[PDB]
Design an enzyme around this catalytic site. Structure first.
Site, PDB file in Angstrom:
ATOM      1  N   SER A  60      -0.601  15.590 -12.054  1.00  0.00           N
ATOM      2  CA  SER A  60      -0.820  15.219 -13.435  1.00  0.00           C
ATOM      3  C   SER A  60      -1.019  16.490 -14.264  1.00  0.00           C
ATOM      4  O   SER A  60      -1.556  17.488 -13.795  1.00  0.00           O
ATOM      5  CB  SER A  60      -2.048  14.312 -13.524  1.00  0.00           C
ATOM      6  OG  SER A  60      -2.462  14.066 -14.839  1.00  0.00           O
ATOM      7  N   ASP A  98       0.809  -1.192   0.000  1.00  0.00           N
ATOM      8  CA  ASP A  98       0.000   0.000   0.000  1.00  0.00           C
ATOM      9  C   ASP A  98       0.856   1.260   0.000  1.00  0.00           C
ATOM     10  O   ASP A  98       1.350   1.687   1.068  1.00  0.00           O
ATOM     11  CB  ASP A  98      -0.893   0.004   1.229  1.00  0.00           C
ATOM     12  CG  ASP A  98      -1.820   1.194   1.364  1.00  0.00           C
ATOM     13  OD1 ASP A  98      -1.881   1.938   0.353  1.00  0.00           O
ATOM     14  OD2 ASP A  98      -2.460   1.360   2.466  1.00  0.00           O
TER      15      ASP A  98
HETATM   16  O1  LIG Z   1      -8.315   4.594   2.167  1.00  0.00           O
HETATM   17  C1  LIG Z   1      -8.162   4.686   0.945  1.00  0.00           C
HETATM   18  C2  LIG Z   1      -8.788   5.694   0.021  1.00  0.00           C
HETATM   19  C3  LIG Z   1     -10.273   5.692  -0.204  1.00  0.00           C
HETATM   20  C4  LIG Z   1     -10.890   4.688  -0.963  1.00  0.00           C
HETATM   21  C5  LIG Z   1     -12.266   4.700  -1.141  1.00  0.00           C
HETATM   22  C6  LIG Z   1     -13.068   5.709  -0.625  1.00  0.00           C
HETATM   23  C7  LIG Z   1     -12.459   6.699   0.140  1.00  0.00           C
HETATM   24  C8  LIG Z   1     -11.086   6.690   0.333  1.00  0.00           C
HETATM   25  N1  LIG Z   1      -7.310   3.781   0.268  1.00  0.00           N
HETATM   26  N2  LIG Z   1      -6.613   2.981   0.922  1.00  0.00           N
HETATM   27  C9  LIG Z   1      -5.268   3.012   1.019  1.00  0.00           C
HETATM   28  N3  LIG Z   1      -4.898   1.998   1.831  1.00  0.00           N
HETATM   29  C10 LIG Z   1      -6.025   1.303   2.261  1.00  0.00           C
HETATM   30  C11 LIG Z   1      -6.140   0.198   3.092  1.00  0.00           C
HETATM   31  C12 LIG Z   1      -7.448  -0.263   3.293  1.00  0.00           C
HETATM   32  C13 LIG Z   1      -8.567   0.370   2.759  1.00  0.00           C
HETATM   33  C14 LIG Z   1      -8.447   1.488   1.921  1.00  0.00           C
HETATM   34  C15 LIG Z   1      -7.134   1.929   1.690  1.00  0.00           C
END
Ligand SMILES: O=C(Cc1ccccc1)Nn1cnc2ccccc21
Length: 330
Positions: free
Chosen positions: A199, A35
């Protein structure tokens, strides 16, 4: 040194990718979600509340001869989607694709939220954002990459995510056979702890390119592409019968549609996301309403170049003194 590990989609929609990681002595192999949008390495464990474990492989520190409790240390994280986890911390030996770090902080979950429990395929997260985001208290810990960096041949890692197919994470080298053309590098801001870049604009299908700065983060741990509402409206307007559904929680479209591609700019270069990458399938089993892969960032507070975007590219996370990001077509 270098490492190279295959990353595999967890399901038929590429909702997330898992990469095998060896922890402890003898090795305990767990499948982690790499991640670049967070900075904690945390795992399901023998300490996780039993009712919150449902099929995951667990780390058992007591079975590792190299595990050491990090006295007094705790951690607690909450992700942008509302999920969370928390617990205590060990140090142990962690290896990814042949690359070994000794003394890595391995955050052992005592509690995980329902969405983690419900996903049997993900045994934890391996964060690859900047260590300033790491949640361990009272002594913040370094990511796997930050611990490995000085030993690597080059202070980089690369993400090559597949569309409905395995891909690769490499550490310490750029595989020049893995992309076409050249890599375009772009500036990064680390001020928020993310791989944050700008971007240079976008195009929808065969439409003209719109030059416009779009600040956002490169986030392998986010499934979708989250962009400003103006950009997302312009995309979905080219899909007959697409609409934003308050009840579903985003843009939906008829499953009978053929989706246009989406292009984003990286400097003077262009990355093309094929239309099929933007289809996330029926909103519920048997529905003829499909969920879109490009959604508005308006409720989020940041634009996010998630897997939908990143899997269209070979992406270089350059952890030099001044970090940068590189994108190539592939
Ligand atoms: O938390 C987020 C972003 C997100 C996605 C969807 C709606 C709002 C915000 N990504 N993410 C990055 N690492 C993660 C780990 C678990 C879940 C999501 C994760």
């Amino acid at each position: 040194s270098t490492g190279s590990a295959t990353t595999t989609p967890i399901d038929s929609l590429d909702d997330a990718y898992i990469t095998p990681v060896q922890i402890g002595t003898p090795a305990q192999t767990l499948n982690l979600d790499f991640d670049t949008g967070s900075s904690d390495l945390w795992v399901f464990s023998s300490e996780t509340t039993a009712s919150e474990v449902d099929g995951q492989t667990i780390y058992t520190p007591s079975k590792s001869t190299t595990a050491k409790l990090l006295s007094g240390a705790t951690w607690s994280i909450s992700y942008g989607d509302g999920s969370s986890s928390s617990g205590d911390v060990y140090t142990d030996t962690v290896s990814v694709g042949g690359l070994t770090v000794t003394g890595q902080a391995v955050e052992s979950a005592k509690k995980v939220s329902s969405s983690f429990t419900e996903d049997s395929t993900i045994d934890g997260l391996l964060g690859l954002a900047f260590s300033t985001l790491n949640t361990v208290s009272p002594t913040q810990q370094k990511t796997f990459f930050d611990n490995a960096k000085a030993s690597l041949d080059s202070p980089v890692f690369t993400a090559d995510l597949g569309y409905h197919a395995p891909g690769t994470y490499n550490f310490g080298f750029i595989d020049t056979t893995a992309y076409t053309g050249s890599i375009t590098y772009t500036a990064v801001s680390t001020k928020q702890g993310f791989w944050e870049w700008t971007s240079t604009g976008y195009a929808v299908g065969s439409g003209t390119f719109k030059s416009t700065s779009i600040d956002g983060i490169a986030d392998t741990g986010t499934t979708l592409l989250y962009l400003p509402a103006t950009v997302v409206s312009a995309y979905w307007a080219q899909v007959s019968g697409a609409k934003s559904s308050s009840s579903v929680g985003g843009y939906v479209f008829p499953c009978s549609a053929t989706l246009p591609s989406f292009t984003f700019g990286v400097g003077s270069a262009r990355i093309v996301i094929p239309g099929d990458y933007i289809d996330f399938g029926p909103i519920s089993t048997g529905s003829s309403s499909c969920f879109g892969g490009i959604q508005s960032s308006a409720g989020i507070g940041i634009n996010i170049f998630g897997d939908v975007a990143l899997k269209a590219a070979f992406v270089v996370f350059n952890g030099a003194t001044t970090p940068t990001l590189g994108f190539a077509s592939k």
